[PDB]
């Protein structure tokens, strides 16, 4: 519902999605959280960065 | 592959986020095919569209 989600919680689900070293389900996880939970934005896409950054390269 | 995140490939995001009918376990299935599959993001967006519309009132 866009009762919970408008904008402030699209930019932090976009962020979530251009992590190329999360998969389809990793990241369906991240904004799935996130659209359910609009309070932890920054939270849900901070740990989906540190999944991200974690299986990445370097 | 366009990994790039194109135009319609970011579109195609947000538009499966903004459907209302359609509940979170559907939309990330939707979510996890899209980044696992961006070519798809017509087909799955399209499936996502019939489906929410398939939960709409009346």
Do not use: C, M
Request: proline fraction near 5%.
């Amino acid at each position: 519902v866009d009762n919970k989600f408008n904008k402030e919680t699209q930019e932090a689900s976009w962020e979530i999605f251009t992590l190329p070293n999360l998969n389809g389900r990793q990241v369906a996880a991240f904004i799935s959280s996130l659209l359910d939970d609009p309070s932890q934005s920054a939270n849900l896409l901070a740990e989906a960065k540190k999944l991200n950054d974690a299986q990445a390269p370097k | 592959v366009d990994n790039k995140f194109n135009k319609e490939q970011q579109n195609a995001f947000y538009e499966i986020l903004h459907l209302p009918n359609l509940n979170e376990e559907q939309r990330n299935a939707f979510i996890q095919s899209l980044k696992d599959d961006p070519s798809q993001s017509a087909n799955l967006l399209a499936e996502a569209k019939k489906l929410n519309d398939a939960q709409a009132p009346k």
